[PDB]
Amino acid sequence: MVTAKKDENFSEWYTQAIVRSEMIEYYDISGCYIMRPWAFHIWEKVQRFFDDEIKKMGVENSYFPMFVEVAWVTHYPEKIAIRPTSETIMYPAYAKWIRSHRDLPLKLNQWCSVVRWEFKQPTPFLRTREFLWQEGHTAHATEEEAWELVLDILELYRRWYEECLAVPVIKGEKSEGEKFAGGKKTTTVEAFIPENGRGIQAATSHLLGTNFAKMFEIEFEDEEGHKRLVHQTSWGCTTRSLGVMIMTHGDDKGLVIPPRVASVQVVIIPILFKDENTGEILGKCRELKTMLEKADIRVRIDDRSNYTPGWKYNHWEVKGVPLRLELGPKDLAKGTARVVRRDTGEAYQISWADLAPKLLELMEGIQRSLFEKAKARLHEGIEKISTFDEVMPALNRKHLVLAPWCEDPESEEQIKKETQKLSEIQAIGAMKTLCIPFDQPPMPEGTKCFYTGKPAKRWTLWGRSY
């Protein structure tokens, strides 16, 4: 079981939660972690969802080799690099494959692993040296088609997070300082970790435009015979989502997994003690499983002989199975069963004939409530502000600030440095742009930038970050 409290030692809470749920296992080489099945299941679930969705958009999956903060092979010619990202590997193929408008749009995606070999200290799931992800890359005849694909993908990532992991996130555009180098515009979804006040980027959807197109000479001819440059997008998202899910829904007893990505939604734990009604208990469990699976609920019966009922309670609690269904001899005479829901503890006595509808209802209810609570904590962690004097208070309450900004990059860099210096004084760490939210709250006519006094351009979300 898990000792530490989420809200006072967050770090050791997090690692107890991911280790004692058999999600992670540690490894020789720092910043690599073994992803055990209990996590891999969730990843498979979100993978299936995103893959179905992007296949509906006409994206096709592919595999490009891993050879081309970078890592280099030495011996067994030339040095070979391991892909940090595969722009450099894919785009020459793109330049060869595209020659006329009749070959656009071209939309490829790949699920693979990448290596980003930073020497700072890792955080499992969140900042690792090898992570699993997807990366998609499209080229279009026009910029407007490309942009709408950027936004369609960003909406998928919203769903990936909100709809599947019940994690609330913010759509926005990245500042010039923090956008992708040599992209034209970088959109993003951003999450919030309330326990340390930090923001974290959840996924990216870049509008590359034509910069790569000309570096790599990816060109096509329209219906006139004139060769134009293609407009490109790339986008991707990683196992970091799992981490953000954990930190969003964990409590002092361990994980809490939203039903939509839980591989076991209902665990049926039989109470056996002193050989009382063992055969009937086990029969009823198997019948309840049959019935619940007929309603497409994912059921496991923990009928393992070598474990105590109370051990099973705590085992599936810490693993975060959303619904536990206890069945013993009393309930055999009653035709009901006790169901405990992992997110609140509440118990219910449900009739067997009512299990399937009722359990479905409970599961929808759990998912929604995980999301709504989470969404609440997010919008209560966002302090809108007018002046820079209001920044450090909010930072110390572990919140983000939403302020008017003039949007020039020197603004951001000196804000970064100044807030890190102030942090170091108070300790005797920096605050950066998180994003420029799509949903722009009202901007009065005369409003001035919260740092420079210059005329404001847009509302911008700032805070400490990963």
**Interacting residues toward a second copy by CB under 8 A:** 25, 27-29, 32-37, 40-41, 43-44, 60-68, 70-76, 79-80, 82, 93, 96-97, 100-102, 108, 112-113, 115, 117, 119, 130, 132, 263, 304-307
- Residue 127's binding partner out of Ca ion, ligand 1XK, a second copy, none, with CB under 5 to 8 Å set by partner kind: ligand 1XK
Is 76 a binder of ligand 9SF (CB under 6 A)?
A: no
> Residue 100: helix, strand or coil by DSSP?
strand
**Nearest 5°: CA angle at 344, between 341 and 349?**
40
CB of 205 to ligand 1XK, least distance (A): 9
Is 116 a binder of ligand 1XK (CB under 6 A)?
A: yes
**Site size with Ca ion, rule: CB under 5 A:** 2
Task: Give the list of residues 6+ apart from residue 74 with CB closer than 8 angstroms, or none.
Answer: none
Is 85 a binder of ligand 9SF (CB under 6 A)?
A: yes
> Residue 203: helix, strand or coil by DSSP?
strand
> Residue 235: helix, strand or coil by DSSP?
strand
Q: Pick the closest to residue 2 from 313, 12, 264 (CA basis).
A: 12
User: Judged by CB, which is closer to Ca ion: 25, or 148?
Assistant: 148
User: Judged by CB, which is closer to a second copy: 13, or 38?
Assistant: 38
Is 266 a binder of ligand 1XK (CB under 6 A)?
A: no
**Overall size of the chain counted in residues:** 466
Binding residues for Ca(2+) are 148, 152
Task: Give the list of residues 6+ apart from residue 141 with CB closer than 8 angstroms, or none.
Answer: 101, 104, 105, 220, 222, 228, 230, 231
User: Judged by CB, which is closer to ligand 1XK: 31, or 250?
Assistant: 31
CB-based burial label for 384 (10 Å; 0-12, 13-18, 19+): middle
For the beta carbon of residue 179, count every other beta carbon within 10 angstroms.
19
Q: How far is CA 453 from CA 18, 175, 294, 433, 446, in A?
A: 46, 19, 64, 18, 11
CB of 1 to a second copy, least distance (A): 18
User: Judged by CB, which is closer to ligand 1XK: 88, or 314?
Assistant: 88
Q: Which of residues 87-116 bind ligand 9SF (CB under 6 A)?
A: 87, 116
Q: Which of residues 203-242 bind ligand 9SF (CB under 6 A)?
A: 204, 206, 234-236
Q: To 10 degrees, the CA torsion angle through 206, 209, 214, 220?
A: 120
Stretch that binds ligand 1XK, among 2-10, 129-137, 350-358, 398-406 (CB under 6 A): 129-137
Stretch that binds ligand 9SF, among 50-58, 82-90, 267-275, 342-350 (CB under 6 A): 82-90
Where along the sequence are the contacts to ligand 9SF (CB under 6 A)?
A: 69-70, 84-85, 87, 116, 135, 180, 204, 206, 234-236
Where along the sequence are the contacts to Ca ion (CB under 5 A)?
A: 148, 152
